[PDB]
Amino acid sequence: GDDRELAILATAENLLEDRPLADISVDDLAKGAGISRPTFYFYFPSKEAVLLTLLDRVVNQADMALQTLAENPADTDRENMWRTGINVFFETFGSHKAVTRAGQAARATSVEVAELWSTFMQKWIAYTAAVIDAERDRGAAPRTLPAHELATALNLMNERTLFASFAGEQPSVPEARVLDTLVHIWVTSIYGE
Amino acid sequence: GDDRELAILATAENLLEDRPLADISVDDLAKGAGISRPTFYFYFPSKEAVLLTLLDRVVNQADMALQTLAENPADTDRENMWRTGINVFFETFGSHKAVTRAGQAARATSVEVAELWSTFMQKWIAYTAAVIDAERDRGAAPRTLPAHELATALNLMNERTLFASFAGEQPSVPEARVLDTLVHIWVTSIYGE
Numbered sequence A, B: 001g002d003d004r005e006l007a008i009l010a011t012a013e014n015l016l017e018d019r020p021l022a023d024i025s026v027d028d029l030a031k032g033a034g035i036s037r038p039t040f041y042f043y044f045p046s047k048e049a050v051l052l053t054l055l056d057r058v059v060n061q062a063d064m065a066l067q068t069l070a071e072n073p074a075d076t077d078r079e080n081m082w083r084t085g086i087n088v089f090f091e092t093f094g095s096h097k098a099v100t101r102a103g104q105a106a107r108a109t110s111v112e113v114a115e116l117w118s119t120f121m122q123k124w125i126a127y128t129a130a131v132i133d134a135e136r137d138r139g140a141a142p143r144t145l146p147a148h149e150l151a152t153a154l155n156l157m158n159e160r161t162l163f164a165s166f167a168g169e170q171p172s173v174p175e176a177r178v179l180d181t182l183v184h185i186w187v188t189s190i191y192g193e
């Protein structure tokens, strides 16, 4: 049942490594999952809905990992604290590059994908701003920019920079340098005056 | 001649304030420019080519303004130097929000738009890295990250942050706060250790 569903999702993620969603058919997804086309339509209204589900899965996986970290602080300095946090997104999305790539593109096209992305970005920015505020309250960070505005720009930076790196865009930061690059900018901008 | 061309471009930019390129027809562009459909096809192969030209115009306008600034340094501190530079992009793209919005979306869709964007981003990143290197050479900035990598991430930040603000995305930095926010992050990340 949800085995067929998981087979459909696994096929879609596998096929998206080779080509865009536009060049993948329902017949392609049905074939890979070992089901018929009408049986596919039982589980999903469209190939677009398959992608929405795959992205939902990835975004929630990142979110849950961040929640785990938030409840279980590593015992480090401020630089390492932010690095471990950014690393949740680097590893999670980085482990699902085809879904990430297809899901970012689908924002143009799909109100549900746009809203999914928007919902979680708002949550991650709010969490970021809450940590910056805590750092200021404890006297570890100076009161410079509005924390929510700073958080917004830094999150958008990470979105654009991580995804360009993963896609091998020209220009992009090399994937093996993107974590150090982002951590530098986060730490200097959050702690600097 | 190039009056009809300019009328076509002016119509397209006007129409793009109201709706996406998908909901604009060649017949729409011909009508607004006071020409027939075949006369349109004389000047442009497609509505897509009209957008490519409008974006080319905007991107070159920004580039030329930056070149002017590069030849004519304002006499200020380092914060103001970067602010004036970022402001070229804020004002130029900000004066053409519909073209910016449509042109960013067309990257998914159009190899020529993707390459145009890529070419100029590479140029602006190289210029950014050259200024950071000059600042380090003069002893004004510390030798932290690889300057080209730092430049890349900061440029990508500006791309994503400016365009989210202009489009009124959720989330976004308010347009009236985006310049201060970006300048802060640029200055702290370039001069901070």
Ligand SMILES: CC1CCN(C(=O)NC2CCCCCC2)CC1
Binding pocket: A066, A082, A085, A086, A089, A093, A121, A124, A125, A127, A128, A131, A155, A156, A158, A159, A162
């Ligand atoms: C404590 C924070 C939470 C937010 N962080 C992020 O990297 N968020 C971004 C990840 C890139 C992909 C899009 C989402 C924004 C840093 C750690």
Ligand SMILES: CC1CCN(C(=O)NC2CCCCCC2)CC1
Binding pocket: B066, B082, B085, B086, B089, B093, B121, B124, B125, B127, B128, B131, B155, B156, B158, B159, B162
């Ligand atoms: C001396 C630098 C040159 C580059 N700068 C930029 O803002 N570039 C970005 C502008 C946003 C739109 C996309 C292009 C990247 C800062 C000033």
